[PDB]
PDB file of C-alpha atoms and ligand atoms in Angstrom:
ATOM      1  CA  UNK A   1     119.899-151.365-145.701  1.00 30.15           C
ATOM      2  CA  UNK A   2     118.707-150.322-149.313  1.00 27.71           C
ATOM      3  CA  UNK A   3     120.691-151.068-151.947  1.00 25.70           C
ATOM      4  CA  UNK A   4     120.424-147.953-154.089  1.00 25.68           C
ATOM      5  CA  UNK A   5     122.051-146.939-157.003  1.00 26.04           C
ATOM      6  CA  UNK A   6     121.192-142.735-158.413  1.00 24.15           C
ATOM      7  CA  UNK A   7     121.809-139.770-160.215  1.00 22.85           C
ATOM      8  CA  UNK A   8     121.217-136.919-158.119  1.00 20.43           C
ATOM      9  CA  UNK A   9     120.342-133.537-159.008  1.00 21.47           C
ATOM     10  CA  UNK A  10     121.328-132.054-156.335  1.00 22.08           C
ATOM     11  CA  UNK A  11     120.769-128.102-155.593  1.00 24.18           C
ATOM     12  CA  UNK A  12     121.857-128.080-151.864  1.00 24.66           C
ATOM     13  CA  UNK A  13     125.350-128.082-151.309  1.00 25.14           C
ATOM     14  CA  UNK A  14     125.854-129.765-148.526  1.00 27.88           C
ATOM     15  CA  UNK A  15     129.836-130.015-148.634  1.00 26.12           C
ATOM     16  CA  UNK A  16     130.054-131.671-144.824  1.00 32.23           C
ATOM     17  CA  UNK A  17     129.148-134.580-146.324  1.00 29.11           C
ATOM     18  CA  UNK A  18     130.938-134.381-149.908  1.00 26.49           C
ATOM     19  CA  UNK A  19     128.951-132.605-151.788  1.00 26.80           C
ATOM     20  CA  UNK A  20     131.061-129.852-153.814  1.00 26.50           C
ATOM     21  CA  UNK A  21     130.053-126.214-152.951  1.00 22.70           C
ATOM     22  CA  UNK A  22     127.726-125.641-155.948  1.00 21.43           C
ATOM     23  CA  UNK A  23     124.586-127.445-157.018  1.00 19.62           C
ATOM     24  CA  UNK A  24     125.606-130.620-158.976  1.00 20.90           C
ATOM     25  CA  UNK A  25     124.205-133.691-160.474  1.00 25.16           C
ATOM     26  CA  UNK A  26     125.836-136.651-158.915  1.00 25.16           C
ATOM     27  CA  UNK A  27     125.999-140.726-159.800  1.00 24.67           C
ATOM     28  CA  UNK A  28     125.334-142.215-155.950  1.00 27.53           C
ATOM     29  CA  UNK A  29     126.709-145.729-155.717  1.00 30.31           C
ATOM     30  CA  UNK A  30     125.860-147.403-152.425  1.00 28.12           C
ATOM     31  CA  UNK A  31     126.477-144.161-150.526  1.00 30.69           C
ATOM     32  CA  UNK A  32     125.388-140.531-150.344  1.00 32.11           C
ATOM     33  CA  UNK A  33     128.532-139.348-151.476  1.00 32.67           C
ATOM     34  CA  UNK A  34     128.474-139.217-154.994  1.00 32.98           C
ATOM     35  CA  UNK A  35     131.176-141.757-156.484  1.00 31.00           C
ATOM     36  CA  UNK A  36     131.297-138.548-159.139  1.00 30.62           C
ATOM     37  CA  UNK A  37     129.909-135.217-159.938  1.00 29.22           C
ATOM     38  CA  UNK A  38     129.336-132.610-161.839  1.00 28.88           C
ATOM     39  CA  UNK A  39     128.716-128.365-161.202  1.00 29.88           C
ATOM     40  CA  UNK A  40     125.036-128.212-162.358  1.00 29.61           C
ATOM     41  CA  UNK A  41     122.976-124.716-162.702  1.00 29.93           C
ATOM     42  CA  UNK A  42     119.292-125.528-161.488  1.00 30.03           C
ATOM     43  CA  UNK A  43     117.397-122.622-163.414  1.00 31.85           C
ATOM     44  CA  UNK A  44     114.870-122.009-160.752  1.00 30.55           C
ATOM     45  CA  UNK A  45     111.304-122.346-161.925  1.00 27.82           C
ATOM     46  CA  UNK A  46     112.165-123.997-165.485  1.00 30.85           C
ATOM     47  CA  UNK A  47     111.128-127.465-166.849  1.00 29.11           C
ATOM     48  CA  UNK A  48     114.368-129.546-166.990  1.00 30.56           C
ATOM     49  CA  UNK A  49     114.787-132.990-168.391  1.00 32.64           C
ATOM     50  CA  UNK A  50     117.588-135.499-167.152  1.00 32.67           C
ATOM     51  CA  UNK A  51     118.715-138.715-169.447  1.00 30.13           C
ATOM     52  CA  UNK A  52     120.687-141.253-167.158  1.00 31.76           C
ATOM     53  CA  UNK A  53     121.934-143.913-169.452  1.00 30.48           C
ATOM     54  CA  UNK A  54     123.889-147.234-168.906  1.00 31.05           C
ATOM     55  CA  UNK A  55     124.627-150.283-170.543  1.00 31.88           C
ATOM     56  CA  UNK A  56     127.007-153.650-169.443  1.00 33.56           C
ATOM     57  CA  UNK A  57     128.635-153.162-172.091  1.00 33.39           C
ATOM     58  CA  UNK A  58     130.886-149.960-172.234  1.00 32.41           C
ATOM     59  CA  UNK A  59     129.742-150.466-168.218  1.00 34.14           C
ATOM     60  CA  UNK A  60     129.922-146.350-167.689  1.00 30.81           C
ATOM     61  CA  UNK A  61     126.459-144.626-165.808  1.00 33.96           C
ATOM     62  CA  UNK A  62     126.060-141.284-167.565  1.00 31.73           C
ATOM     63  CA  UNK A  63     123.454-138.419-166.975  1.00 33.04           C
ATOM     64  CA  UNK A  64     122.971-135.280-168.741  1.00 34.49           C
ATOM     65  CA  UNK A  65     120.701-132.637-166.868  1.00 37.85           C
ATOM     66  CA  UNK A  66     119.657-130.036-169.247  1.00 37.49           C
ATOM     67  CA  UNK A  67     117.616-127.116-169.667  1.00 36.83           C
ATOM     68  CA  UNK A  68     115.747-125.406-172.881  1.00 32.16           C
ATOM     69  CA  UNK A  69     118.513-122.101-172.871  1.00 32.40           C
ATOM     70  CA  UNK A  70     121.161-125.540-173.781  1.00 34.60           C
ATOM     71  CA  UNK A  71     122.951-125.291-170.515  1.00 31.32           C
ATOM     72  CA  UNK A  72     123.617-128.943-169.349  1.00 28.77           C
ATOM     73  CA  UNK A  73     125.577-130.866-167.076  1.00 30.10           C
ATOM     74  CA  UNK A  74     127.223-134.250-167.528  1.00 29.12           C
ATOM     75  CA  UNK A  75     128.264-136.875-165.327  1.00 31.79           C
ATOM     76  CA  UNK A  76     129.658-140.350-166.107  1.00 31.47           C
ATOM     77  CA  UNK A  77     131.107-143.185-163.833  1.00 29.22           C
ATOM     78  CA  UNK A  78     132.818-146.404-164.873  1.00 29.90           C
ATOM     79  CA  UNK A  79     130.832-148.907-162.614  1.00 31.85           C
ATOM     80  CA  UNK A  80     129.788-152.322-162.926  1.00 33.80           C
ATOM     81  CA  UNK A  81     126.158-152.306-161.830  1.00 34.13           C
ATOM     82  CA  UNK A  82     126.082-156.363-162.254  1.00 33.34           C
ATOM     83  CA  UNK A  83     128.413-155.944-158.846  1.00 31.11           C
ATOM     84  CA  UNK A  84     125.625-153.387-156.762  1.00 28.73           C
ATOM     85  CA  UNK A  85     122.250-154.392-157.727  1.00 27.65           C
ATOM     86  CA  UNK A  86     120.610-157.242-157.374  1.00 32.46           C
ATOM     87  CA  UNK A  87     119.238-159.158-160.426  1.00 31.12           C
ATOM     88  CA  UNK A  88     115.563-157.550-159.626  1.00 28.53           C
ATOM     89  CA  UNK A  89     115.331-153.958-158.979  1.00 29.62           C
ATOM     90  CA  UNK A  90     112.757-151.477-158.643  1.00 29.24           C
ATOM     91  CA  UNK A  91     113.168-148.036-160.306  1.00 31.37           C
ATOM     92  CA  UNK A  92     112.277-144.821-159.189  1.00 31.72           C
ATOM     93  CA  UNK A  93     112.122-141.027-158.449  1.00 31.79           C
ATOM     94  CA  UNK A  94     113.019-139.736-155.159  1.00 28.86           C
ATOM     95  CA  UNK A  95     113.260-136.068-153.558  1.00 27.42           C
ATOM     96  CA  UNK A  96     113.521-134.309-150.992  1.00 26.31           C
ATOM     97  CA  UNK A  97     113.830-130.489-148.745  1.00 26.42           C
ATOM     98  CA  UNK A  98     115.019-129.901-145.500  1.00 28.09           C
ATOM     99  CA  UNK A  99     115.515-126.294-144.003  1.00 28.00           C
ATOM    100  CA  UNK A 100     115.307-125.031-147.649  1.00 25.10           C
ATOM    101  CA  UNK A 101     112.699-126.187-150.203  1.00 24.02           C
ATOM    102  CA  UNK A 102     111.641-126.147-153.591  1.00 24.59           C
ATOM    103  CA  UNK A 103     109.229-128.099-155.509  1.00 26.73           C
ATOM    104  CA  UNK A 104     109.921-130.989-156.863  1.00 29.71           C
ATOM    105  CA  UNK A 105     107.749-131.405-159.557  1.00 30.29           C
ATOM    106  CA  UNK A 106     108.189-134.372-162.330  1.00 31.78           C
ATOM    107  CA  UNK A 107     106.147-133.513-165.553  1.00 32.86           C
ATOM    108  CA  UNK A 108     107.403-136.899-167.520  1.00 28.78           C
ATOM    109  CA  UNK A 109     109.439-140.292-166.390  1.00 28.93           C
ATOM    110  CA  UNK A 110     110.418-143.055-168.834  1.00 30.48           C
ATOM    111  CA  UNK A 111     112.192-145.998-168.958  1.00 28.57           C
ATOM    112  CA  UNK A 112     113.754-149.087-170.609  1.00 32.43           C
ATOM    113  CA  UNK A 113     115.829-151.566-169.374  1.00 32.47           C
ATOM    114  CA  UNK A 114     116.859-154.264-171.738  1.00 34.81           C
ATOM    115  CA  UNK A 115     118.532-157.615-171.815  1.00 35.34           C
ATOM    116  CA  UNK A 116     119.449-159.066-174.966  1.00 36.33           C
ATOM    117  CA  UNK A 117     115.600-159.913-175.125  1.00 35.09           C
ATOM    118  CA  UNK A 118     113.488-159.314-172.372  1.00 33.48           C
ATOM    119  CA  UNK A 119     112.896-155.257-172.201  1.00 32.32           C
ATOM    120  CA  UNK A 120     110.529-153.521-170.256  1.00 33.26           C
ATOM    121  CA  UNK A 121     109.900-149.832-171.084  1.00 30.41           C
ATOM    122  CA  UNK A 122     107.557-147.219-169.610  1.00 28.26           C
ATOM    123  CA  UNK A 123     106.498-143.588-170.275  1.00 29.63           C
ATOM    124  CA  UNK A 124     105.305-141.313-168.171  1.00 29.34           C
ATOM    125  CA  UNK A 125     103.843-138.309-169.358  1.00 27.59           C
ATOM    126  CA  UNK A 126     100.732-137.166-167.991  1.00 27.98           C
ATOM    127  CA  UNK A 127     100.888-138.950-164.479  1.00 32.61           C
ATOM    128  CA  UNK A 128      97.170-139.110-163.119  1.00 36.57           C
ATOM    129  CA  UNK A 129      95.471-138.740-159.738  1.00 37.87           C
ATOM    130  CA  UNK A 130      95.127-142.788-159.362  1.00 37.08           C
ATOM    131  CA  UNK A 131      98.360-143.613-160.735  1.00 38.12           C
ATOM    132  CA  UNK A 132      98.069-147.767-160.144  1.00 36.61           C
ATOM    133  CA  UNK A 133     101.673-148.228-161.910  1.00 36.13           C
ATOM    134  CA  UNK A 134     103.589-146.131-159.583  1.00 40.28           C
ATOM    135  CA  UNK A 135     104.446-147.167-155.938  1.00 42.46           C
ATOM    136  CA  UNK A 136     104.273-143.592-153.803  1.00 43.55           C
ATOM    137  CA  UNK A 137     106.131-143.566-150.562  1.00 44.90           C
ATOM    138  CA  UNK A 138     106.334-140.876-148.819  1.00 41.97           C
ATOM    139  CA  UNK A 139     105.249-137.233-149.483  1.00 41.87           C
ATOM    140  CA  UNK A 140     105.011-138.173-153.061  1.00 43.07           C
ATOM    141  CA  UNK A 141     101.421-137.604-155.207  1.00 45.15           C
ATOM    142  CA  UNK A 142     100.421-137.654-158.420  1.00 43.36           C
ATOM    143  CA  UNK A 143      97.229-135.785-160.680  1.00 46.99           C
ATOM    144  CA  UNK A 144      95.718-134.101-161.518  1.00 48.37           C
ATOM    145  CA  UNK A 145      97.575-131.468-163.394  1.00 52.36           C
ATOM    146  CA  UNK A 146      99.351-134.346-164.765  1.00 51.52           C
ATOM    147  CA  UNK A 147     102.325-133.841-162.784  1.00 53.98           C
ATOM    148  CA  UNK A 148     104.296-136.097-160.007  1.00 56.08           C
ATOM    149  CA  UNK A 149     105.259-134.071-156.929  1.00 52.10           C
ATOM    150  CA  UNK A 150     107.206-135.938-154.967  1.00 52.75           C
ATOM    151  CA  UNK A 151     107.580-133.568-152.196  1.00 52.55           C
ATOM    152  CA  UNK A 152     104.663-132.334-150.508  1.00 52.60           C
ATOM    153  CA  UNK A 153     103.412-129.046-151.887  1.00 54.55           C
ATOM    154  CA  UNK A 154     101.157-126.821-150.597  1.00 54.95           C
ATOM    155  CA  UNK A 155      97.604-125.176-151.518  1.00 55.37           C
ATOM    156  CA  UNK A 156      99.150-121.384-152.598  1.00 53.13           C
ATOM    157  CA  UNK A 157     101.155-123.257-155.089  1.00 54.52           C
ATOM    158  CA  UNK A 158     104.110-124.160-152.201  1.00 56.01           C
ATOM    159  CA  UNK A 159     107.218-126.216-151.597  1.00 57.71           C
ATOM    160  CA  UNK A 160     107.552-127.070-147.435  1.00 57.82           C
ATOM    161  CA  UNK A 161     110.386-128.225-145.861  1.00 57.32           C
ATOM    162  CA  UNK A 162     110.973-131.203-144.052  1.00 56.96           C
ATOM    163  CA  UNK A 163     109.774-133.504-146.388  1.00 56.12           C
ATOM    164  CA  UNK A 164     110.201-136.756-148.567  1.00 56.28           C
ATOM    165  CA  UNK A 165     108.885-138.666-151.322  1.00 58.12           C
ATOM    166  CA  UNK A 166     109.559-141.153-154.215  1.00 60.63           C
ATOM    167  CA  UNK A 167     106.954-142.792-157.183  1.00 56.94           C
ATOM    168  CA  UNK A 168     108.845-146.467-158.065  1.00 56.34           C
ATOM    169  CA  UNK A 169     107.674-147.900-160.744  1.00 58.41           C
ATOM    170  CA  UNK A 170     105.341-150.889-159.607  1.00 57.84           C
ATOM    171  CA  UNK A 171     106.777-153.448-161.631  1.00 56.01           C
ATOM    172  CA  UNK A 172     110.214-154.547-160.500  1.00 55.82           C
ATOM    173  CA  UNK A 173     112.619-154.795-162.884  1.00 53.62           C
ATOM    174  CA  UNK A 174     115.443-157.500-164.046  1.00 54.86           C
ATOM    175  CA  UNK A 175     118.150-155.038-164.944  1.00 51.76           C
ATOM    176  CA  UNK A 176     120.625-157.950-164.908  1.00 51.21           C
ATOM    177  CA  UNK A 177     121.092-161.268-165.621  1.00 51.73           C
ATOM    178  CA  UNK A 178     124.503-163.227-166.354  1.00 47.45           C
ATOM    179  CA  UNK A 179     124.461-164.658-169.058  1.00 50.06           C
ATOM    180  CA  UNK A 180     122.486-161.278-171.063  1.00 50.25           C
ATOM    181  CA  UNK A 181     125.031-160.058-173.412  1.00 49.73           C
ATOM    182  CA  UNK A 182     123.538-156.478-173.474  1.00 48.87           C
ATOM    183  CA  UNK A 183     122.068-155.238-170.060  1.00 46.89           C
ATOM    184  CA  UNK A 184     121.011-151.763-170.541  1.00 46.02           C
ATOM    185  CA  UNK A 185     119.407-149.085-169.223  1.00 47.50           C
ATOM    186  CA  UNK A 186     118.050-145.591-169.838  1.00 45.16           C
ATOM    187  CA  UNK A 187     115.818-142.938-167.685  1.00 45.13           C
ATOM    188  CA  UNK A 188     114.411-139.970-168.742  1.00 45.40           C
ATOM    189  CA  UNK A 189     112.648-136.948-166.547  1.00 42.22           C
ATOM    190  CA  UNK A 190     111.638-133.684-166.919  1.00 46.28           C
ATOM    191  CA  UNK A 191     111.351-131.772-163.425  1.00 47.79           C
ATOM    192  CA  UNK A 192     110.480-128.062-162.368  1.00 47.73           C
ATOM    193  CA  UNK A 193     112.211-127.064-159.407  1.00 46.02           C
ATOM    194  CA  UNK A 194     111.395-123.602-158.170  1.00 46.43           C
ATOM    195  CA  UNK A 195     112.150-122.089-155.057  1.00 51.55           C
ATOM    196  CA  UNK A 196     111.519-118.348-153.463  1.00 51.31           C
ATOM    197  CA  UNK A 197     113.735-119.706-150.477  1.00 49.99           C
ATOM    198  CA  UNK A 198     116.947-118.039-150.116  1.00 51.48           C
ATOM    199  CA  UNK A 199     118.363-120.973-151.259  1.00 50.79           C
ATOM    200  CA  UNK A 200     116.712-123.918-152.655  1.00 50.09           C
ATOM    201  CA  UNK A 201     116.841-127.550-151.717  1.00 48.95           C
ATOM    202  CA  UNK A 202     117.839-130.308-151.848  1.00 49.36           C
ATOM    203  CA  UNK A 203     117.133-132.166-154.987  1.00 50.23           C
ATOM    204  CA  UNK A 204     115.536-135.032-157.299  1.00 51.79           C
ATOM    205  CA  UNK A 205     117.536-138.045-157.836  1.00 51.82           C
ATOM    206  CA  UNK A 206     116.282-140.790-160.197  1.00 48.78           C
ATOM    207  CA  UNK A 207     116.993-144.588-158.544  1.00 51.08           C
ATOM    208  CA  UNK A 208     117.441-148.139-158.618  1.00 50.34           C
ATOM    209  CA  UNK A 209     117.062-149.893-155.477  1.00 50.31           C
ATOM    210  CA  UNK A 210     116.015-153.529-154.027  1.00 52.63           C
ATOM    211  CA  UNK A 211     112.426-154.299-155.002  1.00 51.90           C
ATOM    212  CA  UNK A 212     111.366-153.979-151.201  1.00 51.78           C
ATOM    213  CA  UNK A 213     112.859-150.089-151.017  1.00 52.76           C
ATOM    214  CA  UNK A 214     111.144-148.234-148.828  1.00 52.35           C
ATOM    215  CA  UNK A 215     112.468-143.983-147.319  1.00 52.72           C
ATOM    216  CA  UNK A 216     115.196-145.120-145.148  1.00 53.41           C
ATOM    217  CA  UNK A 217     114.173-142.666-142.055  1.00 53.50           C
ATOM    218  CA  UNK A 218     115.199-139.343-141.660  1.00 50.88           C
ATOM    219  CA  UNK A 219     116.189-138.976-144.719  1.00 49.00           C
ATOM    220  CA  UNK A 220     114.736-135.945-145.710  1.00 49.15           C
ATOM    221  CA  UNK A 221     116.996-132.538-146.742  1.00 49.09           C
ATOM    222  CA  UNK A 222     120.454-133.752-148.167  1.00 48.24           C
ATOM    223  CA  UNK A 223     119.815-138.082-147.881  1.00 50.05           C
ATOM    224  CA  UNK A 224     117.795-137.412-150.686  1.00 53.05           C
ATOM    225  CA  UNK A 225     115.428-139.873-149.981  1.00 53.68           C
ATOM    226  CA  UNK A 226     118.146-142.542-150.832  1.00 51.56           C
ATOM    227  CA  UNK A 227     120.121-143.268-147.761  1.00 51.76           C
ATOM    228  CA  UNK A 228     119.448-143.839-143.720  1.00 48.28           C
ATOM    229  CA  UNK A 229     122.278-141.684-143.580  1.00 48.59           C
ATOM    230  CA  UNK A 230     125.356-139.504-145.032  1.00 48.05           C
ATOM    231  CA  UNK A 231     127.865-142.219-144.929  1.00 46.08           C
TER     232      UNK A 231
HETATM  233  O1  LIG B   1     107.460-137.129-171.346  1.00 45.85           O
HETATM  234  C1  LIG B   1     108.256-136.229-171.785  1.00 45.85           C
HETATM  235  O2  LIG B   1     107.963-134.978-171.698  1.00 45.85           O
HETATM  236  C2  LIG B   1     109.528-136.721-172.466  1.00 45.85           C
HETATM  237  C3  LIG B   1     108.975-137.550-173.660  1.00 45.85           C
HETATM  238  C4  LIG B   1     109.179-139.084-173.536  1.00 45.85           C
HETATM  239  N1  LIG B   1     109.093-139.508-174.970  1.00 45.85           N
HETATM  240  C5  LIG B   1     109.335-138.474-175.831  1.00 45.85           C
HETATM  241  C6  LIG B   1     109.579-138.500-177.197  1.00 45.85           C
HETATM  242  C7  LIG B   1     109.789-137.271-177.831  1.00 45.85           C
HETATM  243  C8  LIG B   1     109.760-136.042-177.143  1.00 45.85           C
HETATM  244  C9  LIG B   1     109.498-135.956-175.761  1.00 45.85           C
HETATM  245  C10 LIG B   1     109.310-137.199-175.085  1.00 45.85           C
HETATM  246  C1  LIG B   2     125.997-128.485-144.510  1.00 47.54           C
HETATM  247  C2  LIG B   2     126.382-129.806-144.833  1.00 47.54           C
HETATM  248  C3  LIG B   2     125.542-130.922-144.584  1.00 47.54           C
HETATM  249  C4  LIG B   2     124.317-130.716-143.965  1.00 47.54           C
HETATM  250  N1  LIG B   2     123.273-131.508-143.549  1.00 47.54           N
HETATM  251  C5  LIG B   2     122.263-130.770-142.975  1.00 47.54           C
HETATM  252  C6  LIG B   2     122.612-129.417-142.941  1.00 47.54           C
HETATM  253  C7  LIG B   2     123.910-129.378-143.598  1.00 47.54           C
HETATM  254  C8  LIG B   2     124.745-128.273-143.858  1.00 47.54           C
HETATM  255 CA1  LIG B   3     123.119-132.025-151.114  1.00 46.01          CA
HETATM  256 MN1  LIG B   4     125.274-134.226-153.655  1.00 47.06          MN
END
């Protein structure tokens, strides 16, 4: 199976699997169930932007999920990423709905992994209808508004349910290597997620996976994309 490593920003609680009973970002180690987690507020219909930051040195995976009022939400978890990924990773953006829906809209996506040096860095922020750097699997399509919607949308402006998507980033990466002093990481992303549902769902998560990743299947609604499965 995929070996994926995420932060999850997760609106659907779907606490008969481990998620707490609010919406929450989550760091996702190898499993669904997020090694750690935080209560986070997804302010329906506003631009957000999530940082997810690591480094081999302090060795701690931290994401802030933010919105313009300043509400935020933190998460960090001491992990040693040189121990779950392999040397060569893709990286990527991955959502999903299920019986409730929302869009999943990313407006920007950059990155830069480092090992000190080789670095590669990349910046997203008009995404475009033939976007030759980004892998799309799934429902996921880009342009040509500029945006990334990783979940299919529909013509009256409108989130469906049911599906899946991710946009890795083409190149794969080499987010480790033993004898790099530094191996670092950052992500950034700004999303929209807006929902008229009763209740929106289920989330964006930003990942790393093996180079080959591909939407484990079913894994639509609360697998986020990530995982064959809630285990
Ligand atoms: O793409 C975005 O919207 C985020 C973006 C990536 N580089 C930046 C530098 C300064 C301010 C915003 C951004
Ligand atoms: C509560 C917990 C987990 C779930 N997976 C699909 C529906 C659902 C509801
Ligand atoms: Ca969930
Ligand atoms: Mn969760």
């Amino acid at each position: 199976a995929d070996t994926i490593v995420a932060v999850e920003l997760d609106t659907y609680p779907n606490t008969d699997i481990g998620d707490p009973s609010y919406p929450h970002i989550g760091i996702d180690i190898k499993s669904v169930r997020s090694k750690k987690t935080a209560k986070w507020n997804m302010q329906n219909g506003k631009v957000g932007t999530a940082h997810i930051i690591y480094n081999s040195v302090g060795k701690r995976l931290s994401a802030v999920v933010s919105y313009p009022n300043g509400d935020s939400a933190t998460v960090s978890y001491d992990v040693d990423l040189d121990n779950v990924l392999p040397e060569w990773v893709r990286v990527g953006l991955s959502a999903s709905t299920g019986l409730y829906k929302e869009t999943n809209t990313i407006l920007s996506w950059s990155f830069t992994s480092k090992l000190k040096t080789n670095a590669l860095h990349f910046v997203f922020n008009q995404f475009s209808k033939d976007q030759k750097d980004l892998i799309l699997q799934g429902d996921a399509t880009t342009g040509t508004d500029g945006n990334l919607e990783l979940t299919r949308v529909s013509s009256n402006g409108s989130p469906q349910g049911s599906s899946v998507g991710r946009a890795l980033f083409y190149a794969p990466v080499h987010i480790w290597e033993s004898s790099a002093v530094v191996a670092s990481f950052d992500a950034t992303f700004t999303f929209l997620i807006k929902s008229s549902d009763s209740h929106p769902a289920d989330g964006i998560a930003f990942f790393i996976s093996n180079i080959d990743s591909s939407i484990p299947s079913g894994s639509t609604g609360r697998l986020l994309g990530l995982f064959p499965d809630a285990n």
